[model samples]
Target chain A: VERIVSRDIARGYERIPIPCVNAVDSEPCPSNYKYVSQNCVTSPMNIDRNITHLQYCVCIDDCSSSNCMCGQLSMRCWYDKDGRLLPEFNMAEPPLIFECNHACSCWRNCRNRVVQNGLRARLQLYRTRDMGWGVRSLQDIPPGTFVCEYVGELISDSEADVREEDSYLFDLDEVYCIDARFYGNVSRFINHHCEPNLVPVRVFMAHQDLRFPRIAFFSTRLIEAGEQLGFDYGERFWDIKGKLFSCRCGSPKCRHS
Target chain B: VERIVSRDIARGYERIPIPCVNAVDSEPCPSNYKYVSQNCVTSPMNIDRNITHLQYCVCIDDCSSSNCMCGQLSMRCWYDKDGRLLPEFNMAEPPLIFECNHACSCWRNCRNRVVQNGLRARLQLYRTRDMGWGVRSLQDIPPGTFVCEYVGELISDSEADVREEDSYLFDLDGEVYCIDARFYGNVSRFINHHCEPNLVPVRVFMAHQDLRFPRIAFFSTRLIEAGEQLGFDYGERFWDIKGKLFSCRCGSPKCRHS
Candidate 1:
C-alpha cells in the first residue's frame, strides 16, 4: 500500500529536468523554453541571460487548508559546464539528485519565488562554524525563493522498520531518515543552529480524506549572500523526542551526540 | 640490499610488499599488484559463468609456493549472449593499484571487484543481533583466500602518536594504530565492527616500493580465490596492549562490539 495519501494534486503540474526555461525570445520567457506551470512564471527572455537556465520553485504547504495533506517529492539541478541543451540534457548527475521523502507539513516559511523578482526569494549556499553544506538565501524571501528542494526516495515508516534489520541501517538510534512525507525536507538534515539564517514555517495541504500539516523554511531577515543556513535541529526535532541521541551539528548550544 | 633480518620475523615479513608472477605470460608483474610470487594456475574458465565473464581468477594463496608470493592474474575475455567471444579482447586487467603512497609495497585491490576479492580480509559487513550494521567476516575464509589488506594513511609511529592528540585516530588509551604488516590490512578494521554491519568492504590496492622487502601475503598451501573485501576505519583501536585486539578481527565466536 502507498504510505503517503495519494491525491491528484499534481493533476496539472508537470515535471521537467534542468534548463526549465529556454534562453531566447523577445519577451522574458523564450518560445523554446518549457516552464513548469505550477512552480514558475514566464518572464521576457534576454535570450542570452536567463535562456541558458531553468529555476524550479517548491510549493510550500498551507497548514490552514482543510482538505490537503503533505507528500514528499524532491529533485535537484545544477549548471553543468559540459552539459548539453534540450534532448541530451535529461541524463542524471550526481550530487544534483539526492533521494528523500515528503510527509509532514512543517515547511511553511520557505517556499516558492521568481527570479529577477524582488529580493524576497533568493537561494544561498555557504559554509559555516557548524557542520558545513546547506542552503539559504539573502533577504526575507517574501513567501517563496525556492530555498532548497529535497531529492530522496519515498518509503513508508514500516519499510524503514524493515531496513533497521540491516546492521548498518539500524544501529544508530539518532540518525533518522527523511524518507517519509510526515517529516519535512530541511528538518531531515536539520542540525542545531545557534544563529539561524532561516525560519521554519508550517502549512496545510489537501489529501483525499483529510488535510495534514507540514513544516518548511523562509529567511528571517536580510541574510548575507554566503551565510550558512542553520536551524535548531536538536531542539525542534532530535531533542524534544526524549531519544538519547547526541547533537553534533556544531551549534553553540550543542547537546552531545 | 633487501632489508633482510632473522630476528623481528613477523615485522620483517610484513614490512615489504609481496611480488607475484603473471601465470598467463610468465613474466615479473608490474610494481603495482603487490603479492608474493606464486605458481597457482587459473581455475579453468568454465567454473562460475559470472566470474569467468570478468576475466580473472581468484588467487589460491595456500598452494602458491612461498618462493613466488603474489596473487594470480588471469586473462580478459567476455562472452556474449550466445557464449561466444566478442571481436575485440586480449589484455589482462590490472587487479591492484595504490593511491596514498607510491613507496610502500601495498597496492590497492581492484575497486570494481572489491566485494568478491577482499571482503574476507580483516573486516566483514553484516547485520547484528540488535538490527544494526556490523563488520566481521573472518570466520569461514580459508587461509589461502586474499584476506584483509592494509588501509590507512602510512605514518611513522612517532608521527601517528603526535596526530592522535585531537583527532579521532585513536581511542582513550591510545595504542590503536601500531599494527604489523600481516595485520596491517587485517587488523585495522576490527575494532569498528559492531554486532551490526553498516560498513562493507570498498576495495584494496598494492603500494609501489623500490626496495624489495615490502610486506606482502605469502601462501603456505595451494592458492585460493581472492577473499572478501571489508570496511575498516583507518583509525580504531583498543587501549595499548592486552585483550586479543591483534588476534580477533571482529569475527570471534563471541564477538564483542555487538
Candidate 2:
C-alpha cells in the first residue's frame, strides 16, 4: 500500500520512490506539481543542447590519481577513495568543483563521477505542523553523501516572477534563474534552517558555462534517517523577504529572528 | 560482536542495547562511567523514603476520565490515548505535569503515567568529530515522546563538585543540584545545540512534592527517527566557558560566528 501510494506522488517521475505522510493532521497532501528530475528551459533558446564549450578529462586512472585534470579544476580530489567527501572538507571555503563531465575519457563508473550519479540516499516528503511541506531522509546519510539536485525550471531573470506570495526562485547566475513553483523535483520541497545539516554546492556538469551551473545539496555532517533535510536559503532572500516572513524554525541562531 | 561490545559499555545495566560507532577514526569509546537508569542520592538525608508527603490520585477510571484526580494535580491530563504527549502541547508555556503515583487507585497502564514509565524509545551511542560522545535514536519517534529522564546523584549544593575541570551539574531546585560526572543514564551522552534541535526538557512530578526539586525529563520537539541525534539547549550560562573554547559546530548557519 505504501509503495503504490508513494509512486503516485511523483507520478512515477522518479526512480526512487517518494512517500508523502501528512500524519500531523487531517489535511491532505499538497497539490501535485509536474515532477522533473533536472532543470528544464521553458523555451528552446536556453535548452541544454550546446556541448562545444564543455571540457573533458582524459585521465586513464579513472580520475583517482592526483594528476587527474578533474582534480586540477579544484587543485585537489574532493572525494576520498571511499567515494565520500574528504572527512575534513570545509564547507565555508568550498572550491569550484568540476566533476568528470560527459566529455571525459574516464569510465562512467569512476569515483570522480559523484554528482553525475543521481540520488544515492532515499528521501520522503511529509507535512509539518507549521513549516508547510518538508523533505526528510529514509536512510542514514553520512557526511558528504549527495542528497539531490535543486531541480527546477531554468528561466531568464527577466522572466522570473519577483512576487513573494509563493516563492521558489533560485537565481542560478546573473542572466539565468531557477523557479520551481509549478514544475520541480523533491528538492523544491526542502525548507530553510538557520543551521542546516545540508550544504548547497555548485557543480559544472556537461559544460562549465559560468551562466549555467547545477546546484546540488551535500550533507555537511552525518545525518540520521528520518531527519529533515534542510539548507540555508542564504542572506539575500531573507533580507528582501524578512519583514513579511515569520520564520518559526525555533533555532536560537535563526537569522529570521 | 556488536551485541557483546554494546553490553560491555552499559555493563549489563540498560535493557535496550546502546551501540557505539566511531566511524570517523579509531578512537575508543569514552571511559565507562558507572551506569545508572534513574536518580540516586549521595547521602541518607535526601533519600526518597518519606512518601507521606506525596499527594495521591484516587479516581477509579484508570486516570482516563476527565475528572481523574491525576488531572486535578496539573489541571489537565498531559498524556493522550497513545501514551504520547498532546500533539499541540505548548513548550514555551509548559504546564507542570503531575502523574498518578503508587498511592493512586488507577491501573499501572494509565495514560497519565509518562515519565515514571522510563525510556520508551531506543537509543545508541556514537562519536562526533568535535562533540565528544553523542547519541542517536534506533527507531522512529513522534513529537512529545518521553525520551529519557535526566537522572543523576541528587546532592546538596555544598556537596556538589565546584570544579570546572569537568561539568555535568544540573540544578534540581532550591538547595539541591544534580551531578552526573560519574553516575548517570544514557541522557549523559546527549549533546548540546545552539538551535534547531530535537529535544526539550520539562519538569514533572511522580507524586506531588512541594519541595523545590522536580524530576527533569526530555521530550522530542519534533518527529525524528533512526540516525538523528537528539539535543537540548544547555543554556547561556554553559556557553560562557564555551565562548573561549572553539567553534560551535552545531552546524546552524546562524551559529554565533566564532
Candidate 3:
C-alpha cells in the first residue's frame, strides 16, 4: 500500500535529485516542503546587515596550505585528503568549521567547499514503520562526510515564538532558530535518534556572520549504505509542551527509555 | 527582495519540469506542496471495492474508428488526429470523457488517451502581482489541449468537513466526493482562480471504469499562447465560504469581481 518515486525529489535544487519511496504505507511522499540550497532569511526584513551574501576565500593550491585566508581561524587544513572531517577532531565538542566562500579565489571544487557542493552520497527518503519519513544513505559514507545542511527559513527568536509551530525546528543560537516546519531542503525528512550516526556541526561558508552560522550534518561513524541517517534533536526539542514523542529510535543509548 | 527559481519547479514529475519564479515578492516559491502525476486516493481503506485497477479497451487502429469499444459511449473521436481534445466539444456542457485503458490492445500512444499520457504543453509556475501562485504556458497550446488534471488526495466528504481550514479543496459531488490539494498536489494547484478563465474542467474517467471518482481534468478553451497565464473559475461558492476574504485581481474585462 505504498509508492516509489525514482526521480529526484529536490528537482535538481541539490547537486542530485533525492529520490523518495514509501515502502511501509500508502503515503506517496512526505508532506509538502520546499527545497532550498541555503538558509533563507524569511522574516525581520530590517536586518539587511545580517545578510546572507558572498564573502572571501583562498587563492593558491585551492586553500591547500596553512596560509589559506578562508581559515584565518585555522593554521592547518581541517579536512582529510579525501575531503572529510579529520578523525582527530572530537565529536563530543566539535569545533566550528569555515569553508571557502564565493569571494574566494580558489577553484570551485576546493576541498574546503564540501558542504556548498551539495549532497555527495545518494540519499533516499522512505517512510519508516514507527517514525514518519526518514532518509537513508544509498551508498556507504565515510566518517566526517558532509551529508547536508539543515537549511530552512532562518527566523529570529521572537518571530519563531510568535508563529504557530510544527516540527522540523533547528535552534542555532540564543538569538536565532532555523525552522524547517514549512520550508526546507533534504535535511527536513531526517528523524531524531538517541545514538545517531550523524552529528550536527556548525559551519561558515557564505559569510562571517557569527549569528547565522550554517548548521550542517557530518557522519560521526562509518555509515553503511541503506542505514537510516539521524542525529540528536536534544531534550530541549522534546521538552516543549505536548511534544514528548517517545523515542522510537531504538539505540541502547536511547535516553528516553 | 524577491527570488527566482530558474530550474523546473515540477522537478520532472510532469512531462517537463515546471519552473517557478517570484518576480513580485520575496516568496521564492509557492508554499510547500507535492508534485503528483495522478490523483492520489488518500483516505478510506474500503476503496479496494472502489479499486483503481485496470479495465479493457479497443483492439484495433489505436481506437481511431467510430466502432472502437472504448467509445461505446461516443460517436466521432473525442480528440483530434494529434491527440488533442477536439475543439468542437462545448466547454459549457462538457461531456464525460473515457480514455483508453492499460488493458487496451491499441498502440500505447493512442489519440483517445490524452490525459493519461500526462501533460502535453510546457507550463511554468509564476507569482502574480497580487495572486499568490499562478501557472502560465511556456509554449503556445492548441485549443482543447489537455492541460492538466486538478488532482489531489481524493477523500470522502465527511472526512473533508472534519479536516477543515485549508484551501484547494474541490468538491466533486455534493455528498460523496472531495479533492483536497492543499498539501499533496501537482503544478495544477498553482493555477490561480479567474472570473472568466481560459481553462474548463472536464470530468475524465480513466485509470478505472467506476464512475465514482472521475478526474477533474482541465482543457484549454482557446488557443493559449506562450506568455498567457492559465486559470479556471473556482465558482462564487469558493469566495463565499473562504474563512479569509480574498480580492479578485484577474484583470479580465468580463471579470465579475474586478
Candidate 4:
C-alpha cells in the first residue's frame, strides 16, 4: 500500500529520469532552459551548459531593463530581447514565476540575498511544518537584511481551482500556486512558537504602470538566532473552526484548528 | 591498512556471528535473546569464552535465592563459574558479572522500568573507539525520566590500577569504565547526538549487590538535535572522529560510519 501510494503520487509529475543536457554546451541540464541577457549578477555556480545539470539551474529572470525576459532554471535569471529585466512572477508560460520587487538592487544581488538567507535559515525552515511566510533568526536581523525570498510561480486560478488536481497545494491570498518541493522555501516549513520573534507582513507589488498585482511577505519583529519564523496564511483562506487547515505550529495560544 | 587494522582488532575478540539455537524451541535464535524467569531475566546473547570474547554475548545473571539459575539454559550458579552472577562493582577477576541483587526490583521492573524509561528518556549507551563508554539518545526526551541503566563491571581503584598497568587508562571521572561490546543491554545500542541533547545518563551497576546505578549528565539546557549524536568530544582518545558509529539494538540501523 505504501509503495502503491508513493508510486501514484510520484507519477503525477513528469519525470525526466535521464538528465537533460543543453545543446549549446553539450552539458546536462533540466529539460526547460531559456536564453536571456546576462544583466543580473550571475551566481558563482551559474548554469553551465556542460558538466553541471538541471539541479544547478536557478530560476532567474532578466531585470536589466523594464521589460524582462523569463528563464526556466532553478537559479538562472533571464533577460528580455531588448536587454530589459522582467518580473519573475508575471511570466507568461509554465514553470510559473512568483515575484517580489526591490527596485534598488540588481537581479544578481536579489538572487544572492535569497540564497544567503536561505542557507542561514535552513535549520529554522526545517523545524516545523506550517509557517506560511515570515522571517526568523538566531540573532537580531536589522531591517534591509535579506530574509529568504519566496521562490515559486503564480499559476492561474484555473490551475489551483480544483482539489483533486494536485496532491499538495500552497495557497497565499488566492494569488499563487506551488509544487510541494518549493513549499519548503516558503514559511510552510516553520513550526510555530508562543512568543514568536518574527511575524509575516505582506508587501504589495505593482506591475508596469499597473495597480498592485502581487504581494510578498516580510519580517515584522526583532528576531533571535535559532528562532522560528511565522506568518498568518490569512484567515479567509484557512478556516480553523471548520478544521479545514489544522495549525500545528506548537504555539501556546494557537487557535485550535 | 584499514582491513589489516580492523582484522587485528577483530582478533582481540572472537565473533560469535553464528545464530544460537534455542535450547527449548530449537529455533535459530539471534545472539541477543530475552528470557524471563521467576527469579531472573537473562539475555540469550553472550560469548562463552574470555572477557574480551564475551562482547558478543548479552547474558544477565539473576540470582534470586528461590530460583538461583541462569535463564532457559538453567546454568547452576557457583563461585568462579563461567556464567555466575558477578557482583556489581566487583573489582576482582575475569567474567565480570553484573549480579542483580535478589532484593532489588531491577530484574522484575528493569525490563519495563529502566529499558522502557531509557527508550522514553531517549538515553542510549554506545561503544566508543577506546572500548570506552558514551551515552546518547535516538529521539528527543524530556527532563527527569528514567533514561537507561549502565550494566558493566565497576573496577575498584586497585583493579583499575592493575588494568591501567596493562595500558588501560580511563579519564571520565572513573564514573565509567570504558565499554566494548562486552557490556549487554538495550542501552548499548544507542548511537550518538553531537549537540542539542537535554541529557545523557549512563547506568552504573554494582555486581556483588546487584544494584543499578543512577544516571549522569553534563548540562542544564538542551538545544541542538539535528547534529551528530550527542557525545563528549573525546578527541585523540581513540581514532580521529571522522565518521559515526554503527547502530546496534536501537534497530534503526542508520549507520553513520559508512
Candidate 5:
C-alpha cells in the first residue's frame, strides 16, 4: 500500500533523502526540478579563474587544534563536541565564514564540518493556512544547530535575471544566483519571519570568493518542538513581491498585511 | 537666456541645491519624483515604533571623547580629522553602525555625521553601453569613504511587491522597501549590479535600535581610480524579472556572459 501510494502521489521528481512531501495541490514546481544530496550544481558560465576550482586546506592532524590551517582560517568551529552552536556565537559580526571543505585534511567527523555534513535536526513539511507550504521542526532545537543549506540550480546573473519572476531565485553574489523553484531541498519550504528564528549565513568552503558562497541556515534562538523555521527575507524581497501575496507570519513584528 | 532655458527645462520639480542636471535628459524628472535634501518620506503604514521616530544623541561637547553617548554608540567614527577613512578601519566585522543623528548635541563638523551630510565625492550620471544609465566617480575614491545612500519613497512591503516590475526597488527589511525611480533620489539610483562590485551597501542609523529600519548607505570596498563606475549586489532580483533581462556590461574578468 505504501508503494502504491508512493507511486500514485509521486510527481516523478527525483527523490531527495530528506522528506519533501507536499501537503497541498498548489502551483506545480518547475519541470526540471532535480533532487541532490547536498550543495547544488551550476549552469555553464565564464566564472573567475581564482574561484573556478576547489582548494584544500593542509591540516596535519585533528582540525580542533587552534593552529590547524583550516581551523585557523575558519576562525572557530561553529559546533561543540555535541554539535550545538552556542547562542553567543550568533551575531552579524564576522559576517563571512569559511567551512571545512572536501579538500581539507580534517576527518569527516571534524568539528568544523557542521554545515558540510548536512541537516541534523528532524524537520517536516506541511501546508500553511496562508503561506502555501512551510517547514517545521519535529524535535526541540538548540540555538545554533545547522538546519540546512538552501540549494538549487546555480545560474549566471543574466540567466537568473531572466528567471526573476520565480520567487525561488537567491542571489549568491553579483555573478550568480540559486533558483530552487523547480529543484530544491526541504530548506526551500522554510518561510519568512519578520523576527526570524533561523538566519542565513553565507559560508565559503574551498574558495574564498565572495561572489559564490554556500548559504547555510542556523537557529538564532532555542526553538521548541513543533515550531516552524523561518529567516528574515529582508526588505528588498517584499519590495518586489509584496503586492502579490500578504504576509501571514502573524508575528507582532509583521511588516506587511 | 540661460535662466530662461533652465526654467523652461525644469518641469516644476523642486530644485535641489546640489547640481541635479541629468546628462542624457533635458527635461526634469517624472512628475512624482520630488527632490529632497535628506532622508525619504515613509508611506502610510504601521511601521515598527522604534524605526518610526529618529532619536538624537545627547553630546554637549566635541563627541570625540570615549564617554560621549554618540561616540560610544558609533564605536568609532569612519573618518579621521582630515575627513579620510583609513584602510585599517574597513572590514566586514562590526556590521551594524550608529551615526550622529539630528538630535545629537555634536556640531555639524562632528566626525560621526559623515553620511548624513550627503554625497562628498563628485559623481556624474552617464549612459552605459548596455546596462542602461550608470554612475561613475569624477575623482579617485578611497577604500572607505562614504559614497551615498540608496534613497527613494519608503513604501510598505505589499505595495513594493505590486510594483515588482519596477527595477529600482530596494528592500529595507520585511516591512518596508524603497522605490527610487518614481519619487526622489540621487545618482545612487544609477549603480548597476556587478559580480565584482566596487561598492557594498552598509546599514547605518542615527537613533533607532529597531532592526526593521536602518539608514541604507554605500561605501567603496577598495581603492577606485577616477572614472570607475560603482555597483552593488541586487539580492535575488533576477528571479522576478527575467523576461526583461538585459546583458550586464560589467567588463570584469569573470563576466558570466562573453
Candidate 6:
C-alpha cells in the first residue's frame, strides 16, 4: 500500500527537495526569523517607528495618474510596450524605481507592480563542479525581467554581527542583513561571479525610507536558457572572506586573491 | 486592496520559501523529470528482467523473527536499542542492508523501515565560502543516523552521458545514474565529495535482490555536530573529473588536488 505523503512532508516547503538530513528543528525559520512570503518586512532594525504613520499610496486608477505619489517620483514606468523593463533602468544612475506596492491604490495589473509580483520565470537548482548548488534560468530571460526578491530573516546589525561568520548573510545597510541560510528564497542559490549577468537593484515602493528598500535582481543582459545566474558580491566580500575559499569563477577578468 | 498572493504562486511548491531570483523556469525539476516522493523506480537500464522475478522481503510480523530473511543477513540491525543507528554500520565493510520496504508485511514502525520513511532530520541549504550551496545538519547527528537518500530521476547511463556536462549525476550502477539537480531531487543534491568524508554510501535492497541495481543511501560515518557539512567519496571517476576539476575546498589535510 502506497502511503500518501504530503510533498511538504517528503520535502520541506522548499520548492526544491532540500531534505534536512538530521534536522534538530523542523521549523523552516528560527523564532527570531520572520518568514515573509513575497517581500522583505521591516524588522526592529528600522528603530524609528515614525515611518509607520505615513500614508500608503491610494492610486485612484492606475499609477499613471499625475496626482498619484507613485507617478510623481520622476520614475518612468520602466516597462516597454511589451511590458518588459527598459534595459537602461537597471543601473545605479537614474536610480529612481517606484512600484505600486501593497499600499497602492492601483490595481494589481498596474505597470508599477513588476517587482511586487515576485518571480514569473522558471528557475532550476543545479550542482556546480566547484560552486556547490547554483540557480539557472530554464528559459531565455530578457535583460530587464524582475527575477526575485532576496527574502530572509531581517536582523539588526548587532544580530548580523553575531552570526557574521555565516556565509549567506547579505548586508542591507549598516542596520540589517538578509540571512538566507536558515530561511530564504531560491535567490539564495545564486552564486557569486566576478563577471555577473544579474545585478541587485535596491527599490523602494511602500515608503521612501532607503533603510528598508527591497533588494531585487534583474538580468543585466539577455540571458540564455540553462545559463547559471550570478552577481558580483563586491570586492569587500573577497577582502573579508577571500582566504576562506578560492574563487573559481573562470572569467578572464577574475580578481582572485 | 489586500490581495492575498498565494506564496506558492510566487515561489512554487516549497513549504519553506526558497526564493529563486532571476529564474526563468519556476518548476523544481524539468518537465521530463518524474517526481517521486519516495522510493526509486527501476530504470530502462535494468536490462536483465531476470531480477524482476526475485521474491521481495516477506517479514511475517516484525523483521526480528529468527525465521525472517532480515535476521539471517548477519547484518546487525544498525539501529540502537531506542532505534538510533550504531556508528559502526556507517563504514565500508558493513554487511548488505535489506530493509522492509512497501512489499514487506511488517508494520510502519518496523525497525527495518528506517530508510523507506524518508528524511527525518532538519536540513538547511547554505552557501559555502567556495563550494557554492551545500547541505548541513541543523542539529548534532549521532553516527549511523540515516541522513537522506540520494533521490533523483532514475535515468539510464546513456541518458546521463547525453547530459555529461551536468555536474549532479550520481551513478546507481553500470546501467543507471541519478541525474539529480536538473531534475527532481532532495538535499542529497547538495552533498559534495571529500577524500575523507564523514559519510558513506551503502547499497540496500528491499523488494528485489538485483545485485547490480540496489538502492544507494548515505549515513553518518561518525558523530557530526550541528552546522557541519556532509560529503562522501565519489570514486576514481571523480578524480578523472578532478583533472579538469575546480579545486576542492574540502579542507582535509590530505587533499590531493590542493
Measured against the true two-chain complex, the DockQ scores of the candidates, in the order shown, are 0.01, 0.01, 0.02, 0.00, 0.01, 0.01
lDDT of 2 by residue, A1-257 (tens): 12222433553345566878776766566664656666765442233323334566778676889878877888877887666788777887667678876556565566787786776578888877788889989899989888888987777766775545346877765487777886678889899888898887788766576777788889999899889989888776788778787677778988787
**Model 4, CA-based lDDT:** 0.29
Candidate 6 wrong stretches, greater than 4 Å:
A1-61, A64-68, A81-83, A90-96, A206-208, B1-258
Q: Please write out the lDDT profile of model 3 over residues A141-254, one tens digit for every residue.
A: 989888888988788888888877747788877578888876677888898888898899888765566787788899999999999999988877767622555778898878
Off by over 4 Å in 1: A1-120, A124-132, A138-151, A164-191, A205-214, A234-257, B1-258
Model 2 C-alpha RMSD to native = 26.1
Fraction of native Cα contacts reproduced by each candidate: 0.00, 0.00, 0.00, 0.00, 0.00, 0.00
In TM-score terms, candidate 5 sits at 0.44
> What is the lDDT for B40 in model 6?
36
Return the top candidate by DockQ: 3
lDDT of 6 by residue, B2-121 (tens): 222222111221234322111222223222332233333334334222222434456656665656556455356565544556655538765677775433345446667676555666
lDDT of each: 0.27, 0.70, 0.73, 0.29, 0.61, 0.59
Q: State how far residue A59 of model 2 sits from its true place (Å).
A: 1.1
**lDDT of predicted model 3:** 0.73
| Model 4 chain B lDDT-worst window of ten | B1-10
- Which of 1 and 6 is ahead in lDDT? 6
Cα lDDT of model 4 by residue, A120-232, tens digit: 33222121223333233545654323244433333444556743533234454424453233222233333444344333322222122111122233344445565656544
DockQ agreement of candidate 5 with the native complex:
0.01
Give one digit per residue, the lDDT tens place, for model 1 in B199-242: 22212222222121122221112222333323332323442332
**Per-residue lDDT of model 5, residues B156-182, tens digit only:** 667766764467777775345554445
Q: Order of candidates by lDDT, top first?
A: 3, 2, 5, 6, 4, 1
Error of 2 at B133 (Å): 64
For B92-127, candidate 4 gives per-residue lDDT tens digits of 211222333222222322221122122223332333
Score every model by TM-score.
0.22, 0.48, 0.49, 0.24, 0.44, 0.42
C-alpha RMSD values across all candidates = 26.6, 26.1, 16.6, 26.6, 26.6, 27.0
Which docking category, incorrect, acceptable, medium or high, applies to candidate 1? incorrect
Answer with 1 or 3, whichever has the higher DockQ.
3
**Candidate 4: residue B41 lDDT (0-100):** 15
CAPRI docking class of candidate 5: incorrect
